[PDB]
Structure formats: structure tokens, C-alpha cells
Amino acid sequence: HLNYRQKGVIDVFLHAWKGYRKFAWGHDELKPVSRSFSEWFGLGLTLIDALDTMWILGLRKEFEEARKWVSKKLHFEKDVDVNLFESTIRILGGLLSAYHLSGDSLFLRKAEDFGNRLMPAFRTPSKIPYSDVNIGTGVAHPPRWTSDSTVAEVTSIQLEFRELSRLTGDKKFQEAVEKVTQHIHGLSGKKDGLVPMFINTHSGLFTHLGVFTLGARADSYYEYLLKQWIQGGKQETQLLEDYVEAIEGVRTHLLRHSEPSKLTFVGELAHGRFSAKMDHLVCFLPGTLALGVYHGLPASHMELAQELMETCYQMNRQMETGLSPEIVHFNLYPQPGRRDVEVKPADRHNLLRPETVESLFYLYRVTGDRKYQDWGWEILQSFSRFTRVPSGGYSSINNVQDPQKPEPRDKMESFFLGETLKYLFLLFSDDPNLLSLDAYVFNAEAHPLPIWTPA
Ligand SMILES: CO[C@H]1O[C@H](CO)[C@@H](O)[C@H](O)[C@@H]1S[C@H]1O[C@H](CO)[C@@H](O)[C@H](O)[C@@H]1O
Ligand SMILES: [Ca+2]
């Protein structure tokens, strides 16, 4: 039976989806304020990202309609450059999850076609993949000013390629992504398990040495060490070792406490200088920590998970709209009249990102503490109050500090339906058998993939 809060999530989903159907059907993203759409893949991104969410929420007539579009309209031969990481976590991941939940081999067929078109990205001197690959022409290349790739981008594609190999029996996917993981396992230039942001595709070595963040460009490296370890049946001890090492590195080098509330937060390090800057992206970490504890990581990880969950909650509730901005700054020393969570004017956007509600889901699953459900409901009510578009859809906003003029940006990112509402639906569920942590691991875009239950 669905409960009150899950029904609320479904209502939000269906209001979002009626905008997508009316104004953006088959297109990458809804622009709900202007009742139009944008493309970058041209591959129905929001539709693919929401397949498994529709299935999970019981939206079966919508799922059927979307499946028909996948069957007749999804084609990968266009002359278009795609980012390998975004392609992998959203489209390859979303198709694999749709396959597993529905049992419909259409989704696997499409996944295999797509994965084969991404493989030219790995054709580099070091076998660290280029950032971009053209799925129609087979040409892959780095960005225009550099032969570096982003460390998170090359280390956050493994679940999907590993699973694709398992399902298809074609080893090329697994072999390509596992080479990357094994290579990075042996690289110099880490700080107590912390990785730099960039890696050169010619030399295979890290660049931008001495600069450490758990936010953009590095965050999901850590997430995918743990998740690959779980996926593989907990038999790949190097992944676990590198994860355990990295968490101690976080404790040693990046953790500080805010003023006035003494909240634990994760900052950035540049040539030994600490910076109290924290991307909302870093709020993945409490959930990943708690996930690890469920799977046997040390209790110290749970203490840190609970502290960071409170901080991420405050990053939301200390804003006038109750929604976290893209980037916050904390004060290490007392500042008269200031809250814990400071926000630069440029950073005040909210893009409907999932990381807080993602981590609330894990913290509730592992602890059973219903306050985490309450916190997620609070955030959802804030989404409804300040980002809802009457004709359909929800929009990113430019000013989380102005409840009267939040200033919509006219875009519904695919991860609102792929991630934010999925995690909220699961957070509110009365059923631990629903996508059990014993049976699935979620990829970087909330697409559940089966755990390889071991020998
Ligand atoms: C710019 O930040 C994004 O890209 C870098 C890699 O260039 C990642 O390190 C970072 O996690 C995010 S991707 C992240 O963003 C969305 C949620 O905010 C969503 O696509 C998904 O969760 C993805 O992991
Ligand atoms: Ca993510």
C-alpha cells in the first residue's frame, strides 16, 4: 500500500511528467516556463532517465508509452558528440535499470548498441578515455584546450560497463573500464587516498597536483569505489582498501566545523591551504558512508554520516526557500549576525539536485530514524512551493534566498525525475524489500543495478 507521502511524490511526478509529455515529448529536457524543450544528446534524455522511476512508482501506463517511444524512436546513429560520463550514468545506466525492472529485452538491446558506440573514447595512448565521443562518426576527442580527462568522469562509468559485459557476454566493456580502475589504483599523487581532479589521457598521470575536493570532478570516484565493491560481491579487496583509505584522508585533511552551530563539513584543499567551500554535490557523502556501514564498514563511518546528513539538511533549511544552493561556504570562526551556511550571490541557484534526498534515503534505510523522512518531506514541500510551474513541470531557480522571486531558469533537469523523486519515493517507503540494499546498487544517476551475489 502506498502511504500519504509516497502519494505526494507521485503527484509531483505526474505534474512534472504532464509538462514533459505536452511540451517536450521525446526531447532531452523540458523548459517548463516557456513550454518548450532543449536538446544536447537528442536521445530523449529525460524519458530514459525516468523509465525506472515510472516503473518503481507504479506509473505503468506512462512506462508503456515511454517504452513504445524507445522501441520506435530511439536511434543512436546521429552525428553528435556526447560526454562519456554523462552518457554512461544517464542513458546506459537508465536503460540497464529499465531492463532489469521490466524484464523487457528491448532496453538491453538499446544499451548494447549505445555502449558499443561509446567504446572509441578508450582509444587513447594511456587507455584512460577521452571526455567526448561522437556516437555516429566514431571519433572521440578531449576538450579543446587540454588532453586531460576528469577523474570522476573516468572512474564513475564502471558499474554500467561491468554490468553490460555481464549481460551481453562481450568482455570489451568490462575490460576497458577495469583497466582504468586498476591504473588509478597504482597512481602517485594522492593525499592519503584523496585524488586530484584531472588525469592526462596521453601520460596516464594525474594533473592539477595538490588540489583536493570531494565535490565536482572527484566526488563520484569515492562513491564508485564502494559501489563497485558491493556490486562485485565484496571480493575486490583493492576497491575497499582505496575507499577506506580515502575516508581516513577526508577525516584527516578536509573535515572542519562551522560557526555558530559547530556543524561538520567537508572543505577543499589547495597546496595545503584549506577552503571552507562545499558543493552541494558533496552531500552524496553521508549516504555513501551509511551505505558502506550497512555493508560492514566501520561504525566511525556512521558517526560521520550522521553529522554530514545534519549539515546537508541545514544547507537546505537555512535558505529562505528551504532549498540548498549549488555551493555553500562555512565560517570557521564566529561572524556576528551570520548563519552557518553562507552563499555567494553567484552560487544561489538550485537545479533540483538530488544529493541531500539521496543521502536521506540511505540514512533512513540504515538507521530507521524517521526524522530523515521528515527532513525529506520538508525539502519536497519546498520544491513544490517554489519551483512548480502551473502548466506542468518544475524548474531550476536562480535565487534560493528569495521566496517571493526565486526566479526560475526555465529548465527541468533529467535528474529531477531520474533521481530526486525516486529517492524521495524510496525514502518514504514502508518496505525494505523495495530495491533492497542487499540486492541492488544505485549508479551515479539513481539507476539500480543488481548485486552479483557471490560464489
Ligand atoms: C559538474 O558536476 C557534475 O559533473 C562532475 C564531473 O564533471 C561530477 O564530478 C559531479 O558529480 C557532477 S555529475 C552528478 O550531477 C547530477 C546531480 O547533481 C546528476 O547528473 C548525477 O547525480 C551526477 O552524478
Ligand atoms: Ca550522483
Q: Report how far apart, in Å, the C-alpha atoms of 73 and of each of 43, 65, 85, 133, 240 are.
A: 9, 12, 23, 21, 41
Instruction: For residue 147, report the distance from its CA to the centre of ligand 1, in Å.
Output: 21
H/E element, 15: helix 4-23
Q: Are 32 and 393 in contact (CB under 8 A)?
A: yes
- How far, in Å, CA of 268 to CA of 250, rounded? 10
- Say how far apart CA 448 and CA 54 lie, in whole Å: 13
Indicate which residue's Cα is closest to atom 3 of ligand 1. 216
- The one catalytic residue among 219, 223, 279, 307: 219
Distance from the alpha carbon of residue 355 to the mean position of ligand 2, in angstroms: 7
Nearest CA-CA partner of 286 in 337, 217, 360? 360
DSSP assignment string, 230-253: HHTTS--HHHHHHHHHHHHHIIII
Active-site option among 29, 49, 86, 358: 86
Q: What is the rounded distance in angstroms from the CA atom of residue 90 to the CA atom of residue 74?
A: 14
Cα 251 to ligand 2 centroid, rounded to whole Å = 22
Ligand nearest to the CA of 216: 1
CA 397/CA 33 separation, integer angstroms: 11
In terms of Cα–Cα distance, which of 364, 366, 365 is closest to 374? 364
* Helix residue spans in 295-369 (DSSP H): 299-317, 355-367
- Ligand 1 atom nearest the C-alpha of 419 is 22
86 is catalytic: yes
Dist. CA 227 → ligand 2 center (Å): 12
DSSP 43-104: S-HHHHHHHHHHHHTT-HHHHHHHHHHHHHH----SS-EEEHHHIIIIIIHHHHHHHHHH--
Angular region, 353: left φ>0, alpha ψ -120 to 50, beta rest: beta
293, 302, 287: which is closest to 359 by C-alpha?
A: 287
> Which cell numbers in the block locate residue 118?
561509446
Say how many C-beta atoms besides its own lie within 10 A of residue 238's C-beta: 14
The full DSSP string for 331-362 is -SS--TT--SEE--GGG--B----HHHHHHHH
**Residue 248 a catalytic site member:** no
Q: Are 405 and 387 in contact (CB under 8 A)?
A: no
Give the span between the Cα atoms of 268 and 281, in whole angstroms: 13
Nearest CA to ligand 1 atom 17: 353
Pocket of ligand 1 (CB under 6 A): 89, 150, 152-153, 216-217, 219-220, 281, 353-354, 415, 419, 444-445
The ligand 1 atom nearest the CA atom of 218: 9
* Number of domains, the chain: 1
Place of cell 554500467: 160
Give residue 349's Cα distance to chain centre. 18
Phi, psi dihedrals of residue 132, rounded to the nearest 5°: -125, 145
Ligand in closest contact with the CA of 217? 1
Q: How far is the CA of 220 from the centre of ligand 1 (A)?
A: 8
Cα(4) to ligand 1 centroid in Å equals 31
Range of the domain at 67: 1-455
CATH number for the domain including 163?
1.50.10.10
Residue 129 CA to residue 227 CA, distance in Å, equals: 21
CA distances from 44 to 49, 50, 69, 154 (A): 9, 10, 9, 24
CA distance 93 to 227: 14
How far is residue 59's CA from residue 18's CA, in Å, rounded to a whole number? Answer: 12
Structural method: X-ray
**Residue carrying C-alpha cell 562509468:** 157
At position 287, the amino acid (one-letter code) is G
For residue 375, give the C-alpha cell.
527532513
Q: What is the dihedral of CA 192, 194, 199, 204, to 10 degrees?
A: 30
Catalytic residue among 223, 326, 358, 413: 326
Q: What is the side-by-side strand order in the sheet with 273-275?
A: 211-212, 268-270, 273-275
Distance between CA atoms of residues 210 and 419, nearest Å: 32
Catalytic residue among 223, 340, 342, 355: 355
Report the alpha-carbon distance of residue 108 to residue 103 in Å, rounded. Answer: 9
Q: How many residues does the chain have?
A: 455
The best mutation among 85, 148, 281 to test binding of ligand 1, ranked by most ligand atoms within 8 Å of the C-beta, falls on 281
Cα of 176 from ligand 1 centre, angstroms:
22
Which residue is closest in CA terms to ligand 1's atom 2?
216
Secondary structure letter of residue 41 according to DSSP: S
Please name the residues in contact with 253: beta carbons below 8 A apart, sequence gap of 6 or more.
Answer: 191, 192, 194, 212, 269
- Give, using CA atoms, the residue closest to atom 22 of ligand 1: 445
Q: Residue type for 375, please? A: W
Query: Which of 220, 349, 420 has most ligand 1 atoms within 8 Å of its beta carbon, as the pocket-test mutant?
Result: 220
Whose Cα sits closest to atom 1 in ligand 1?
216
Which amino acid would we find at residue 119? M
